[PDB]
Design a protein around this ligand. Structure first.
Ligand SMILES: [Mg+2]
Length: 190
RNA sequence: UUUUGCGGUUGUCCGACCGGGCAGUGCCGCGACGCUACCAUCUGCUGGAUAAUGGCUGAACGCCUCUAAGUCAGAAUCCAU
């Protein structure tokens, strides 16, 4: 069954500027500006009433309608990113070997680089390069905790997952060796 | 090992024992050049795209979740250098 009209709406705060050239969405806010490309989905944008952006798909077969709500949340994530930002907390879990971590901003590229030494007995050094626009800090309030911050949820979430995926145990019972860096709550900066 | 290079030596033949001939390379020791042996010596690089799999954002299906749109890492795999 094809649907003659599917519609989603998104509230835009008054302190945020939203621009859609063709389908490339540019969001400018207090914390900076974010750009997202959506030229792979057939969707129409419009202004409904004084600060709300309407999204509609006109003839969808339940596989295009599904992508309608996905776009709405992605655009809403851009608005949230430039207003309240995204902050991920990650805790260190180990049994015998403390995990030694150092963070440093590369001067040539500008991206933070997370360097992990002393995994479970390991001598190898695990270097993870963060996505652009993500800031990495070691929390002082609580011991053994990383903090990743940035406007882009894709950048922050992918960066946190790269750290977790590189700290995987090999050839051991993973139900016993519960060692690694695992993502804690996923709140906002503000 | 036909360098038939030098030396040794056996049986005949060359007329006085120097130098050689023949025994299909007479036999033995050493033998340079050349050829040659994991029997000797030297040398044999790195992008990119992926598969399984583990993930991010995220609907369908107000909850969720690696997938549906998008996307990350990744094998002696495929392609190329
Ligand atoms: Mg999810």
């Amino acid at each position: 069954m094809r649907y003659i009209h599917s519609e989603e709406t998104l509230e835009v705060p008054e302190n945020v500027k939203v621009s859609i050239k063709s389908r490339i969405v540019t969001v400018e806010g207090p914390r900076g500006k974010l750009v997202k490309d959506l030229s792979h989905i057939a969707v129409n944008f419009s202004v409904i009433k004084k600060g709300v952006i309407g999204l509609e798909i006109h003839h969808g077969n339940r596989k295009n309608v599904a992508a309608l709500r996905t776009v709405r949340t992605i655009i809403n994530n851009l608005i949230i990113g430039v207003t309240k930002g995204f902050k991920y907390k990650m805790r260190y879990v180990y049994a015998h070997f403390p995990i030694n971590v150092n963070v440093e901003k590369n001067a040539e590229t500008g991206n933070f680089e997370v360097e992990i030494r002393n995994f479970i007995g390991e001598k190898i050094v695990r270097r993870v390069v963060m996505q652009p626009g993500v800031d990495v800090e070691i929390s002082k309030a609580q011991k053994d905790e990383l903090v990743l911050s940035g406007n882009s949820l894709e950048g922050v979430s992918q960066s946190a997952a790269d750290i977790q995926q590189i700290c995987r145990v090999r050839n051991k019972d993973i139900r016993k060796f519960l060692d690694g860096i695992y993502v804690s709550e996923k709140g906002n900066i503000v």
